[PDB]
Amino acid sequence: EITKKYIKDNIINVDDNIIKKKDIFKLKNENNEITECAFEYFESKKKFDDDIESRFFIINDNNYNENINLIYKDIKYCGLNIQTTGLEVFDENIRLIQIAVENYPVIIYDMFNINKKDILDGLRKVLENKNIIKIIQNGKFDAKFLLHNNFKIENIFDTYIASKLLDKNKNMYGFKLNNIVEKYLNVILDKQQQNSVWNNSLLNNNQLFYAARDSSCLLKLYKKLKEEIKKENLHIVNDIENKCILPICDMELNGIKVDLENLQKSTNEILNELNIEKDNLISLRNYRRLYKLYSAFYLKLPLHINTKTNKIHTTFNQLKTFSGRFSSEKPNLQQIPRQKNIREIFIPNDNNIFIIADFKQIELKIAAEITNDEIMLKAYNNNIDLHTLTASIITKKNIPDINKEDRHIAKAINFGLIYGMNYVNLKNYANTYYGLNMSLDQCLYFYNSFFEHYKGIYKWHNQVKQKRALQYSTLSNRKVIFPYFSFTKALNYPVQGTCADILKLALVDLYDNLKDINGKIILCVHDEIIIEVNKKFQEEALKILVQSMENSASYFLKKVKCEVSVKIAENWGS
Ligand SMILES: [Cl-]
Ligand SMILES: [Cl-]
Ligand SMILES: [Cl-]
Ligand SMILES: [Cl-]
């Protein structure tokens, strides 16, 4: 009776708390004359104890009023959300699309009851329009869905990113829509409706008020978060991370293909090697090595292979690391052995080839930039290697008299001392990881000599030891707050954090430059980016990738020049 009162709009009345109203809304047609059009919208009887827009339009085949698309005129921003039937974008569907516009009830597109393309025309224009901001909670999740369903979208403000950056890695939890709204608005949403059934072709009135309020609330969060971002000078990083959403969606939708031939083959190889070692039993070495490399990889990897496409679609995390670097899970691309024997199982698609680029010594160059160390900066500008430079200082030799053994000792000194080791730790570090046999009298000479010449590094280290601060920033002003002071983590953070800024910005510029040649971004790990392109744009994509990374480094570094090592390859092991 009341339960089916609005079945023509595909709505179930679960508690008699929904009325259909019809009123005259003032609009402007493209001819700049005010067309007052009457619209049917829904509203609750029991009013909500807050100020969020809880009314909503619903769009379907039987009530579509084309004049609805006139609310989208001369708008600069709008809240955007979707409701899905599940988490996996390949196995699920978009149930709803909600667009909240300032002062108007939310426009809800009933996707399960729309079969005319002309209805979604006004929608696609808003999504594509680079001049309208779309405010989103979890933009990766929602953009990933829209992209996979042939929706184009540009210009995004993720409230999750703003909230995560404002927290400065002080918390792991508290970044769901419900928590954010309770903190910045003191409103509690009916989160119970997450577990409701979105698969049916009917929705109840409670599901639709949640869909409206969880989209309009974005309009108020944007105003508060936009402001806090500015008061914390986080606009540069927040802008880079928002633009980096689309590249990351690219990397997850594209996935990376696997060559099941060499996978099965190599699997049998390691299996037989394990059997042989078991019979002979060298013991610990070959047995533990082959056992771990077998079970912790050759057996787990097949589980993530898409059965139909032979592709792996990892999950890239944008803001879940301390430094700000990317991380991945299911699978964890940095847990794959860095060996050519194993990495050659990942191949491009048919008629395509990989282009792989890395930075040489970006971390050490960043340290020289932020410390204004003159000897290091002058040496890099003369294209003198930093390990040769340190070898020159330690041995007092001229570059023509420096042998490979000198540069090896210099590598240990540089990586050990720049990041805050003392001479006693340097000895253990050197003998352990480099195979040297230095004495404490030598390492104390290295320590005193290193900081006697690298006066920028010494001033850097000394001031950090003195202030014992808990707040640190990067060159993008990505901020973090330590629970307690740690010398080595304070030195490492600005360096590693700045790498994250440079790589992420490189993916933004790269994602734009690759449209001409329909290039695909595949993966970013450590200091390395991988793209896939058709072989005819091989030589052209090489230049784009290098130029993108170099332009990014140029954005942040003014006194030192990065160096990109690029190579075309058919497999990841090359
Ligand atoms: Cl959420
Ligand atoms: Cl600041
Ligand atoms: Cl911003
Ligand atoms: Cl570099």
Ligand code: NA
């Ligand atoms: Na969302």
